[PDB]
Design a protein around this ligand. Structure first.
Ligand SMILES: [Fe+3]
Length: 833
């Protein structure tokens, strides 16, 4: 059997690059007798206990397959083999070109007595000289460890060592070394000792690990990593995009680095007035944009990813879309039904919980802070429409808190010590008999000037519809949104999804071979996570980044994630566990998902549960194809090393916590897997894709509070009485930070046209050999089609008002699919923004 037809498909560097090529470039084109060489490794025949490798073969072709793909080149080789080489199930490759190419696949056809073999690569191959060992790629055969080809056990073992790479050295672009390190690269201690931030990782501050980058330490701090112009992530975790509009992390680097300078100059040099006057000025943002004169612009130029990214037509511009929560009822945002609806069906839809006892305690110590008990008590909780006692309403599963109190208090002196004036809130909600919630009171806690020990200085507030007191209710509500928007951005979003998924991406690539059942299960749920977190570490959660300067906890934000993380339990992220812990549901096996929801028209948890079991059934089906027993899941060395390093290093600051699955069990594997995918896919989508639709109007979702509350016939109070729009505007997020906020969260809410949503979407039809899982993944994808149909139904039911509101905004967030753009819908597989 003479020649086996290999035919390789690839994408060139200039095609997945934001700048490279013209027309005629860095298009790298005429390939022949060396440019690329391939050796075939044997699955069947050995030399020792290692498959035969067979003769460097040049890529003697270059034309059409003819359905190759958009901007994909395909090569061809005729490999001279026989039979005593055996069947190939792996290959080594060498790039002799200057440029790297994106290798997609290699199909091995016309192999005698055997079928056409598939290699799914989706990896870049840089020049041969960058590598000690040449690139190895296995065929699409899923193999548990004690299921490897005996010529291939040593290449599989060898390949996982090279991805692991020792814990030394400064990492390069072309590398694929997954290793961990603490968050010690957020500060810039050398260019001022005020930009120095603490390490998030270890004894003192618990946190997950980030990808190791190995740059040099700082001059002033030997235990903190210097900044870099390039932040490293394992090469294949940074995805290119065939289209320029889809480099959204690049458009967010370019906000932080490029747009922000211009704004800083325009405000400073007064090309722009520093603060908004009416609420009609704020709405014009979305009606005509941020304008600036020709001469200023033609000098401070260009930043072209803010292209038809913001579609800034002509000139004298920057441009925002009208947010959905303002598209149809412009003032819907003021209404207490929209204020409370958004707790259940908004931007940050999972903080709220049941009230178990009353008064309402403080879980912080009295010798150091005091009596931080809630002063929302009994009197003001019995209103217009509220026949029950507080004691009947908790009895009846009708009274709810939004506690933004105790995590805030130790950090509040510190938060308020400069340009930001704020409270540590608490907010009681009543589930009205109509299925909707409403606010019954807000205690605003202020620090207390005679020390932390005689604090707080609390003030309760209740609904109002009269004169000036209307606006005091509004400002009381904004001091709660302010508290929540930064609990969102940081905890519900950065820590709970982005930050805690990183150790999973790293632990899977280091201990679970690219050929493993479970590597391939998890794998599509990691798409661009390491890339958006490396740019978040460089341009968003850094000393003076967009998150500190735009959101309330400021310089203390990420230090606060570490302490809130002291309480992060992985088990409770699973959506049943979550609901059951907050008390907005109970385990009722008679009920549809095995849980009865106490707030029954809670749109996030209602659609959520539908998507949770859709994920959990598939990973259970999948896992069953590969483990017929708990005792053979235990018998897997890679999997047990995956979970061992994950819980011990990855999230090692909680490594001795009692809730960690110990992976002795197939159901332990199934919930561990499903929780992860939930976090990566649906949770993240729930808390992220509704950021510009809801918080794209600072009125509706204010990020910073600059003044405190007007008291009683105060000059502040009479100024608010005179014109209340302006004093409100003076309390919340002022213009400059409104603009940087808005530009980030708009990009952050966009779906790239090349996005991979849950279902149907992985990389290739032949990502595995196994026919069972392939068809079990089309059924899971059909299942989501069906579930979307049930969700589309609940948004035509005009009975469920919580999924519409004063805002008239059908809660489209957990709809598993979507078109590109800034839809209020779609569930990607992963944290891709
Ligand atoms: Fe995100």
């Amino acid at each position: 059997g003479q020649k086996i037809k290999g035919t390789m498909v690839v994408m060139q560097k200039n095609v997945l690059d934001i700048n490279s090529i013209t027309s005629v470039a860095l298009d790298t084109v005429t390939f022949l007798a060396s440019s690329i060489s391939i050796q075939l490794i044997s699955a069947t025949k050995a030399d020792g206990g290692k498959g035969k490798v067979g003769k460097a073969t040049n890529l003697r072709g270059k034309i059409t397959l003819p359905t190759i793909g958009a901007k994909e080149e395909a090569y061809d080789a005729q490999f001279d083999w026989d039979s005593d080489f055996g069947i190939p199930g792996a290959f080594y490759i060498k790039n002799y070109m200057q440029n790297e190419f994106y290798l997609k696949s290699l199909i091995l056809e016309d192999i005698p007595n055997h079928g056409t073999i598939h290699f799914i690569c989706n990896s870049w191959v840089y020049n041969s000289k960058h590598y000690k060992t040449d690139r190895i790629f296995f065929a699409n055969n899923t193999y548990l460890p004690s299921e490897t080809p005996a010529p291939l056990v040593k290449y599989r073992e060898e390949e996982l060592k090279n991805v692991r790479g020792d814990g030394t050295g400064e990492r390069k672009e072309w590398d694929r070394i997954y290793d961990y390190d603490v968050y010690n690269d957020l500060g810039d201690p050398d260019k001022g000792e005020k930009y120095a931030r603490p390490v998030l990782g270890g004894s003192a501050l618990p946190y997950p690990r980030r990808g190791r980058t190995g740059r040099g330490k700082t001059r002033k701090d030997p235990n903190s990593e210097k900044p870099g112009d390039f932040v490293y992530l394992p090469r294949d975790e940074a995805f290119g995009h065939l289209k320029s509009s889809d480099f959204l992390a690049y458009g967010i680097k370019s906000v932080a680095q490029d747009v922000l300078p211009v704004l800083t100059d325009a405000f400073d040099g007064n090309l722009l007035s520093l603060d908004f006057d009416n609420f009609a000025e704020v709405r014009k943002l979305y009606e005509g944009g941020v304008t600036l004169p020709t001469n200023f612009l033609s000098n401070i130029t260009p930043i072209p990813i803010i292209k038809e990214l913001f579609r800034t037509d002509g000139e004298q511009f920057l441009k925002y879309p009208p947010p959905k929560v303002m598209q149809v009822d412009k003032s819907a945002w003021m209404t207490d039904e929209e204020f409370a609806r958004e707790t259940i069906a908004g931007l940050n839809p999972n903080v709220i919980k049941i009230i178990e006892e009353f008064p309402l305690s403080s879980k912080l110590d009295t010798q150091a802070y005091g009596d931080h008990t809630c002063i929302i008590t009994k009197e003001h909780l019995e209103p217009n429409l509220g026949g029950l006692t507080v004691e009947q309403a908790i009895q009846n599963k009708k009274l709810f808190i939004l506690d933004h109190h105790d995590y805030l208090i130790p950090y509040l002196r510190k938060i308020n010590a400069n340009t930001t004036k704020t409270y540590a809130t608490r907010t009681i909600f009543f589930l009205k008999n109509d299925g909707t919630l409403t606010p019954l009171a807000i205690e605003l806690s202020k620090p207390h000037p005679q020390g932390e020990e005689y604090g707080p200085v609390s003030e309760v507030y209740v609904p109002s519809s009269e004169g000036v007191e209307a606006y005091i209710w509004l400002l009381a509500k904004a001091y709660v949104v302010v508290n929540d928007a930064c609990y969102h951005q940081i905890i519900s979003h950065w820590l709970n999804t982005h930050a805690v998924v990183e150790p999973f991406v790293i632990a899977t690539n280091r201990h679970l071979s690219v050929v493993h059942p479970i590597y391939k299960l998890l794998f599509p749920h990691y798409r661009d996570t390491m890339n958006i977190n490396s740019l978040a570490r460089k341009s968003l959660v850094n000393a003076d980044g967009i998150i500190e300067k735009t959101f309330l906890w400021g310089r203390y934000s990420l230090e606060m994630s570490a302490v809130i993380y002291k309480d992060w339990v992985f088990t409770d992220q699973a959506l049943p566990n979550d609901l059951v812990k907050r008390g907005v549901a109970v385990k009722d096996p008679s009920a549809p998902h095995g849980v009865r929801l106490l707030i029954e028209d809670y749109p996030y948890a209602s659609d959520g549960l539908e998507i949770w079991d859709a994920i959990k059934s598939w990973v259970e089906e999948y896992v069953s194809f590969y483990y017929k027993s708990d005792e053979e899941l235990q018998k897997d060395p890679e999997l047990q090393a995956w979970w061992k390093e994950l819980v011990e290093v990855g999230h090692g600051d909680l490594k001795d916590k009692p809730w960690w699955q110990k992976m002795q069990t197939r159901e332990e594997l199934v919930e561990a897997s499903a929780t992860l995918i939930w976090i990566a896919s649906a949770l993240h989508a729930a808390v992220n894709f509704g950021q510009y639709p809801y918080g794209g109007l600072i009125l509706n979702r204010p990020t910073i509070s600059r003044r405190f509350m007007p008291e009683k016939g105060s000059p502040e109070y009479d100024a608010l009485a005179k014109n209340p729009e302006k004093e409100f505007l003076k309390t919340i997020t002022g213009k400059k930070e409104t603009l940087i906020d808005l530009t980030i969260i708009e990009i952050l809410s966009r779906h790239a046209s090349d996005e991979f949503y849950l279902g149907q979407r992985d990389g290739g039809d032949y990502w595995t050999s196994d026919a069972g899982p392939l068809e079990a993944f089309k059924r899971f994808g059909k299942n989501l089609e069906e579930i979307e149909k049930k969700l589309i139904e609940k948004n035509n039911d005009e009975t469920l008002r919580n999924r519409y509101g004063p805002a008239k905004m059908p809660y489209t967030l957990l709809y598993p699919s979507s078109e590109e753009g800034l839809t209020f819908r779609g569930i990607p597989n992963s944290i891709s923004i």
